[PDB]
Amino acid sequence: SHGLFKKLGIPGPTPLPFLGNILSYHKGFCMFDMECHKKYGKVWGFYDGQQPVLAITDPDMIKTVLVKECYSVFTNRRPFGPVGFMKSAISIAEDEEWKRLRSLLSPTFTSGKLKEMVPIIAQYGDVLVRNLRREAETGKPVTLKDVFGAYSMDVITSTSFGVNIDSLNNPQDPFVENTKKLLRFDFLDPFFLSITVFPFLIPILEVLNICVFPREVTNFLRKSVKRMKESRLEDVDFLQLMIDSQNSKALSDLELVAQSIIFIFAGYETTSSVLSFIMYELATHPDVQQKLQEEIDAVLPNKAPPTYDTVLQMEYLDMVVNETLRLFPIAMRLERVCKKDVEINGMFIPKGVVVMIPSYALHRDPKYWTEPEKFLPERFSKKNKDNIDPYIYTPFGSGPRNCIGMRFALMNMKLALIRVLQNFSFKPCKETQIPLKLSLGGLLQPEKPVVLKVESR
Amino acid sequence: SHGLFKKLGIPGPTPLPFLGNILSYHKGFCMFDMECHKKYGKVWGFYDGQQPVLAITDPDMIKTVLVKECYSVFTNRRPFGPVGFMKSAISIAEDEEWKRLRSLLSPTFTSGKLKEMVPIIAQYGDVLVRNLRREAETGKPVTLKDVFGAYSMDVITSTSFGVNIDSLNNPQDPFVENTKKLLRFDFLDPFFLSITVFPFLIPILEVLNICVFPREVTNFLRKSVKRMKESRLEDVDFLQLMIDSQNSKALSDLELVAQSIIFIFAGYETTSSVLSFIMYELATHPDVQQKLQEEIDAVLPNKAPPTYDTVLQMEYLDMVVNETLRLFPIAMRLERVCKKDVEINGMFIPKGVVVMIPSYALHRDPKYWTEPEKFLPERFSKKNKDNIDPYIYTPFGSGPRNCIGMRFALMNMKLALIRVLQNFSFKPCKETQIPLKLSLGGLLQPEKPVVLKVESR
Ligand code: HEM
Ligand code: HEM
Ligand SMILES: C=C(N[C@H](CSC[C@H](NC1CCCC1)C(=O)NCc1cccnc1)Cc1ccccc1)OC(C)(C)C
Ligand SMILES: C=C(N[C@H](CSC[C@H](NC1CCCC1)C(=O)NCc1cccnc1)Cc1ccccc1)OC(C)(C)C
Secondary structure (H helix, E strand, O other): OOOHHHHOOOOOOOOEOOOEOHHHHOOHHHHHHHHHHHHHOOEEEEEEOOEEEEEEOOHHHHHHHHHHOOOOOOOEOOOOOOOHHHHHOOOOOOHHHHHHHHHHHHHHHOHHHHHHHHHHHHHHHHHHHHHHHHHHOOOOOEEHHHHHHHHHHHHHHHHHHOOOOOOOOOOOOHHHHHHHOOOOOOOOOHHHHHHHHOHHHHHHHHHOOOOOOOHHHHHHHHHHHHHHHHHHOOOOOHHHHHHHHHOOOOOOHHHHHHHHHHHHHHHHHHHHHHHHHHHHHHHOOHHHHHHHHHHHHHOOOOOOOOOHHHHHOOHHHHHHHHHHHHHOOOOOOEEEEOOOOEEOOOOEEOOOOEEEEOHHHHHHOOOOOOOOOOOOHHHHOOOHHHHOOOOOOOEOEOOOOOOOOHHHHHHHHHHHHHHHHOOEEEEEOOOOOOOOOEOOOOOOOEOOOOEEEEEEO | OOOHHHHOOOOOOOOEOOOEOHHHHOOHHHHHHHHHHHHHOOEEEEEEOOEEEEEEOOHHHHHHHHHHOOOOOOOEOOOOOOOHHHHHOOOOOOHHHHHHHHHHHHHHHOHHHHHHHHHHHHHHHHHHHHHHHHHHOOOOOEEHHHHHHHHHHHHHHHHHHOOOOOOOOOOOOHHHHHHHOOOOOOOOOHHHHHHHHOHHHHHHHHHOOOOOOOHHHHHHHHHHHHHHHHHHOOOOOHHHHHHHHHOOOOOOHHHHHHHHHHHHHHHHHHHHHHHHHHHHHHHOOHHHHHHHHHHHHHOOOOOOOOOHHHHHOOHHHHHHHHHHHHHOOOOOOEEEEOOOOEEOOOOEEOOOOEEEEOHHHHHHOOOOOOOOOOOOHHHHOOOHHHHOOOOOOOEOEOOOOOOOOHHHHHHHHHHHHHHHHOOEEEEEOOOOOOOOOEOOOOOOOEOOOOEEEEEEO
16 A cells, blocks of 8 residues: 555655655654655655545645635545544534534624624633733743643633633632643543554443543533533523524533533634744843734723734734744645545545645745745735735635634733733743754644743833 | 363353453443352453453452462463553562562562551641641532542652642642653543453554553653652662662662652542441441541540550441442452463363453452441451451452552551541532442442531531
């Protein structure tokens, strides 16, 4: 099965029996993609175990794949390990079902519903600040993914179930506990590599009701949600919107829970990780930090509370965000399974092949980015923003299966930063990893957690 | 493979292909054993999946199995699911290795080392009491396995690593968290039944570094212990004793950790569960409660602090304990794998057969116990204690592979009760499950958690 790309005349690294090329993940996904990109060019193929994966780097062709042919051919992602009842979550479902879920859930993530979510996201901004100042006045360097996680948690809990925790001060609350155990899967830990040399074990683990979503976290939320559904009904958040939806093809009950669980993860270690990266940059780039706090004071004088509207009135802030997402696209890769034999942009691609877009690699490709390793937000200036190909820069994917939560994430994030730079400036500690090396793991997160210094303006 | 016992002319329930008799676990292990015991008599066999299990109820024969032939034939328990590096813990190791571990670890559990452990076990008695009185003065019915667990935790943490937590007030402490996730395996949950219809999947999960001991709890303790070992060395608890041992065949480092992890579980949900049962009895039997608080006041006047010595001076207290253990032997069953063809007490038993002693069933067998469903501690009076066959009553097993921690458990437990009945009396609430129905699950724990009323003497 390792002859495939040789036949198609597509170049790539020589696979080992059974292993395919996975030994080459010893420096993380990202480093492997850049290296293939340099060595082979615009297209290459390789083998996660026996599985052909075809990498592509042409924007037309990438558009063809994420847009033009999404429904017909490229509808789904690759399977990755036993998910149990979580089979039914939107990010994991296939074909007509996913097509369906997207619809049931899409209204929920509208700008308009989002704007109603703003003042709740506001209140925990106050918590974040107050918690920070306690560490600021005790001049002790601060690990971010803690205080940001604690914030990221409060937001989720509240924005999706109305649960109102100071999680940084109550990691004791059974709710907060469960919710944390939902962490970014280390796709390069002992498990998933084995899942990829031995995917024939996925059904094995399914019938064994083994689940990558801790059977306890899920058995908790499942019945947790079942209590909420029956206390609201009858006596603004995601659950409401989703409960409203199934009040008609309409969403189910177990289905509803598994969606919640997705939303819960997503907004947690992603929102948390990204902010960490941003403060790392804001910290190792004092001028950018300052220009930012200048925007926030001119659009919002006197430490004025942000509204929905004033947030989007802030362009530089957006630039910084975008630029950070370029440097750290926490997905690293987009993928779609080729469900039929197809020709796209004059290239034959056979069924079962997994088509991959190496986002990380593209973001640091010299050919589109001057000095791509540098952190330069002016890349995304209203002037320069026009020159950036949407199929090269894809922090949130693209097409019918892009990040459904994109607007909410950006709003969520921006809301925190604004309230954080209104009060504090962030400075590198002797202990701050400079330069920030990347987790050679299967996560896009830093090698070492970001520690900085926090001062009260 | 389902013909075995029919050939040997040994009676038992008819197995279904693949399933064996496991459909008959729908009412828990215990109920199935009593039923086989009544229906077939002194011996019977059945099939957990394709695995022959031979049950026996003859004391001679049970002695033969747990004692006389332990080394030669019956050295090990049955495998149960993927344990990863935990392969090396004493309760799980096989043959010469276990034989070895027992020796390295046996001194640790001496009465004499135990006596030095007493005053530490004392101090958290004070915590237990103070926490209780807070709920006592707020006349709100109390779930036991919480406050007892919280106690059971404090003891372990301290008695094995010197870690000194008020865990009831700090379930936030990363240590306490990890430690809790080590809970009594529900052998009748979705997993282990599948493990028993599909044991050929155990090696499957091994190579997948999948572990029944949460890979995170273990990766925590592993490095947690590695920090302690290197802070003590160089600058009274189980770790010390074990560290001392490997200071010579001597214990290893990973080995040392996996032992700790065992000790940690054992003293947790076992100590916790047992006390829960005892207060349930003490509660549904006011007179027994009173006689007890009378012993504790005569051997220890003026709420006198218990010493090692005064504890064993208390006989009734011991009786109550024993009697409770009769009613609720939390192991339910003892097992040993027959590693060779052998004849014992005039019975042929083939290799690979799993020999089982149905402790629960024996404890409620009428033929040894008058009114066995009743709770009557006078059964264990210094007068009557002589009539109890040690091979019928086996709460802690027997022979070279009995409960290594037996003395410590009994001491641990007794120390708590004494300090608890010195201050409080325990009364049934309208909500108290009366009579206490048993978890039809694979655990010996109650159907419903015990809730009682707590009053300040
Ligand atoms: C900065 C934060 C986030 C980033 C960078 C991000 C990025 C992504 C990416 C790269 C994808 C793959 C899309 C594709 O294949 O084209 C995706 C999918 C998805 N995202 Fe996010 N995301 C973020 C936050 C969130 C949040 C807060 C939610 C809340 C629900 C969310 C929900 C989803 C869902 C449900 C999918 C799968 C959508 C589908 O298959 O229909 N994401 N995201
Ligand atoms: C009331 C509490 C406890 C009860 C009822 C209990 C009961 C048992 C039983 C029934 C066995 C099986 C023995 C056999 O097959 O003959 C056992 C084994 C064992 N117990 Fe416990 N136990 C208790 C507490 C503890 C504690 C606190 C420890 C602390 C380390 C401990 C450590 C062990 C170990 C290490 C084994 C396996 C011994 C070996 O295979 O060599 N137990 N226990
Ligand atoms: C392969 C996935 N995830 C899906 C299929 S598994 C469910 C998924 N997370 C899981 C893992 C953590 C607990 C929930 C999701 O959907 N989480 C919401 C989310 C995450 C990140 C960004 N936005 C939303 C397909 C996919 C792959 C990459 C990026 C996005 C989706 O991702 C990881 C590499 C595992 C992090
Ligand atoms: C089958 C076992 N356990 C051993 C083999 S797995 C390791 C074992 N617990 C594990 C499970 C919870 C986290 C540690 C042990 O050794 N825990 C110490 C202990 C427990 C209870 C009483 N004393 C000591 C063999 C065995 C079976 C029954 C009773 C005792 C030992 O037990 C259970 C039915 C699973 C509860």
